[PDB]
Amino acid sequence: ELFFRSGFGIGMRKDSPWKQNVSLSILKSHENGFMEDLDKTWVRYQECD
Amino acid sequence: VGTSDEVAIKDAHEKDDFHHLSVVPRVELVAMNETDPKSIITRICDLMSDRKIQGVVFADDTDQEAIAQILDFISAQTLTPILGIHGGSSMIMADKDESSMFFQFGPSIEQQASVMLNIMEEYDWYIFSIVTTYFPGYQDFVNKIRSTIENSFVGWELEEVLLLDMSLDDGDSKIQNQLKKLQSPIILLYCTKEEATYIFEVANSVGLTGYGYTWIVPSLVAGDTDTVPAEFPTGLISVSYDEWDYGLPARVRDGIAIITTAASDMLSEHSFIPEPKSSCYNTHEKRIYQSNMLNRYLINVTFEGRNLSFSEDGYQMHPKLVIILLNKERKWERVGKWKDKSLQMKYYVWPRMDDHLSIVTLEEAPFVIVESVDPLSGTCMRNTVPCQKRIGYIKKCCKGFCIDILKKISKSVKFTYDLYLVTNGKHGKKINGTWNGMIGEVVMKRAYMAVGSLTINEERSEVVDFSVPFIET
Amino acid sequence: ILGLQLINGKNESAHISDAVGVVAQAVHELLEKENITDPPRGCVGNTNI
Amino acid sequence: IDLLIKLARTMNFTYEVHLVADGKFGTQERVNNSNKKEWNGMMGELLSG
Ligand SMILES: *[C@@H]1O[C@H](CO)[C@@H](O)[C@H](O)[C@H]1NC(C)=O
Numbered sequence: 001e002l003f004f005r006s007g008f009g010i011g012m013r014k015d016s017p018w019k020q021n022v023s024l025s026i027l028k029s030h031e032n033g034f035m036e037d038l039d040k041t042w043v044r045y046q047e048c049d
Numbered sequence: 050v051g052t053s054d055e056v057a058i059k060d061a062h063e064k065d066d067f068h069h070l071s072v073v074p075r076v077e078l079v080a081m082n083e084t085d086p087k088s089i090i091t092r093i094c095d096l097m098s099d100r101k102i103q104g105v106v107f108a109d110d111t112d113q114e115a116i117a118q119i120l121d122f123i124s125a126q127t128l129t130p131i132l133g134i135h136g137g138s139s140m141i142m143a144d145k146d147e148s149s150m151f152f153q154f155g156p157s158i159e160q161q162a163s164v165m166l167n168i169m170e171e172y173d174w175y176i177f178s179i180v181t182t183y184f185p186g187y188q189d190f191v192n193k194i195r196s197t198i199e200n201s202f203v204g205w206e207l208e209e210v211l212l213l214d215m216s217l218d219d220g221d222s223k224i225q226n227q228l229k230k231l232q233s234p235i236i237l238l239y240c241t242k243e244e245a246t247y248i249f250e251v252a253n254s255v256g257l258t259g260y261g262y263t264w265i266v267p268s269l270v271a272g273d274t275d276t277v278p279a280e281f282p283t284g285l286i287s288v289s290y291d292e293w294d295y296g297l298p299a300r301v302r303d304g305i306a307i308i309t310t311a312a313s314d315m316l317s318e319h320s321f322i323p324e325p326k327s328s329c330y331n332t333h334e335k336r337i338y339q340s341n342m343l344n345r346y347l348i349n350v351t352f353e354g355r356n357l358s359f360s361e362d363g364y365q366m367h368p369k370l371v372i373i374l375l376n377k378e379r380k381w382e383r384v385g386k387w388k389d390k391s392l393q394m395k396y397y398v399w400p401r402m403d404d405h406l407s408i409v410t411l412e413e414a415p416f417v418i419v420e421s422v423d424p425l426s427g428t429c430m431r432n433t434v435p436c437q438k439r440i441g442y443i444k445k446c447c448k449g450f451c452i453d454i455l456k457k458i459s460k461s462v463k464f465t466y467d468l469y470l471v472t473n474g475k476h477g478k479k480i481n482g483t484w485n486g487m488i489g490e491v492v493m494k495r496a497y498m499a500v501g502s503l504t505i506n507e508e509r510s511e512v513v514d515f516s517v518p519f520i521e522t
Numbered sequence: 523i524l525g526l527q528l529i530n531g532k533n534e535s536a537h538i539s540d541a542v543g544v545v546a547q548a549v550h551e552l553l554e555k556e557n558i559t560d561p562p563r564g565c566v567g568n569t570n571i
Numbered sequence: 572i573d574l575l576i577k578l579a580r581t582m583n584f585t586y587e588v589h590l591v592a593d594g595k596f597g598t599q600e601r602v603n604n605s606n607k608k609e610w611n612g613m614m615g616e617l618l619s620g
């Protein structure tokens with residue numbers, strides 16, 4: 001069972017002008033079904049039972 | 050002794066409506082500057098020679114630190130009861146002689162140690178330290194506190210019960226090391242009026258006094274309501290005998306009725322009132338007329354309906370106490386009130402308060418659990434934190450999964466807080482351009498934080514900024 | 523019966539010399555001290571220490 | 572009781588059995604006056620004689 005839970009994340013240097021809009025595009029993509037669609041095509045094709 | 054009006058006191062002298070029993074109190078008003086023991090001994094023992102009296106009531110308006118002890122010695126050497134009413138005669142004492150039937154008007158030493166803990170529960174001051182000096186009675190102050198702490202479901206923390214043994218010369222070095230070991234928000238002190246100012250001088254040098262640190266002292270430390278030596282730090286809180294509603298003429302009238310209804314009531318049952326020799330001598334020869342029978346029921350008396358019974362040590366069983374607080378203007382101000390194991394504090398929330406922030410929460414079944422306050426003690430229990438609630442506020446207890454995060458975070462980032470449940474909406478929503486709920490208060494600068502079961506999304510992130518998630522949803 | 527007794531504990535004239543002997547050098551070192559005040563004058567003159 | 576009779580024969584003493592008065596096992600309770608703590612039950616009779 002999982003014993004260290006910490007997700008991924010786009011890394012940026014401190015004092016970066018893009019540090020806000022990058023973190024607001026990810027939140028919107030979760031709620032639009034976009035990141036539940038990339039999972040369908042790249043990570044979740046069953047091959048063996 | 051002191052500055053007073055004779056006619057004002059004498060107006061209520063013959064005012065006791067004691068027509069039920071023929072006491073006939075021949076009250077005599079005596080005024081004399083008798084601070085020194087010589088004047089007392091040459092007057093008390095001469096009164097019986099002139100006027101046949103078997104009862105003396107003493108009052109004073111001086112801050113003498115040993116007048117009660119020297120006045121008690123006359124009671125031990127005689128069989129005439131005497132009561133201390135006002136001034137230094139009402140100061141506390143450790144013990145009395147078995148033959149010294151002298152009593153006072155004032156709270157005992159155990160009760161004062163039981164009122165300090167009765168105001169810390171309301172304001173949730175669960176960590177404290179004790180500083181005590183040598184005095185006849187300082188042993189009971191520590192013991193009474195420990196007994197109450199042991200048997201209680203509330204979370205009491207004790208530390209630095211070190212005492213100041215300031216008796217040797219050049220004690221500044223010794224006091225500084227002892228005083229530097231105090232690291233508690235509130236410190237309880239037990240000293241004398243003169244001894245207090247010595248310790249307070251060292252306190253300001255260290256820097257302990259100020260905001261974040263509070264001191265509580267008993268009645269005798271304050272002493273006077275108008276003589277402020279300007280050494281007491283602002284915010285000092287003390288519990289003292291009521292004096293605004295307990296006037297000097299009223300004290301005399303109340304005291305006189307106690308003695309009159311005691312000796313006369315003995316004639317009702319014993320039917321033989323002793324007549325001791327009215328002189329300073331021949332006390333041993335008059336040992337036949339023992340006053341043990343009189344002493345049996347002189348303490349247990351009643352006047353118009355009340356309990357004025359004294360303890361065996363000579364302390365009033367049901368006294369009246371008030372809580373006073375010093376201000377910037379160096380004038381004592383009334384804050385609290387005590388009457389028959391009841392407390393009525395004027396201030397619902399202590400005015401004194403970046404390190405102090407507000408917190409808004411909300412009840413959710415596995416995360417934030419709200420339970421009612423303990424009925425037995427009227428204060429929140431252990432492992433839970435107090436949390437207010439509107440509708441006049443009501444104090445609940447809050448505990449759960451999210452609260453443990455808040456307590457653990459505040460330990461490392463070292464900041465304080467005070468939660469309170471929201472009452473307008475829940476969880477946040479936007480209606481016609483207005484936010485209501487846990488988010489509708491952060492946006493209006495009434496919270497500055499909000500811990501609970503909030504959900505991150507784009508609509509809310511453009512108004513407030515969230516932290517790193519600690520759970521998935 | 524086994525008891526105990528104190529020698530020179532009941533001779534009052536014995537301790538008179540010892541009482542003033544100890545205070546003899548106590549006053550000597552007290553003389554060379556600053557601000558040597560005096561006790562209250564009489565039973566009525568002063569009520570302080 | 573069957574074990575007690577074995578010790579009496581081995582160590583050569585005599586006994587007499589009496590039950591506890593109140594009937595408890597033993598714990599430390601505080602006296603109402605002050606904080607004097609005394610045991611009660613079967614554990615408090617051993618120390619009392
Ligand atoms: C992010 O978006 C705001 C408004 O859409 C815009 O003003 C800002 O320039 C954007 N950030 C960057 C780095 O362009």
Ligand SMILES: *[C@@H]1O[C@H](CO)[C@@H](O)[C@H](O)[C@H]1NC(C)=O
Nearest residue numbers: 578579580581582583584585
């Ligand atoms: C055991 O007890 C008996 C009873 O008095 C006595 O003879 C002696 O103490 C013991 N007998 C032995 C050791 O043979």
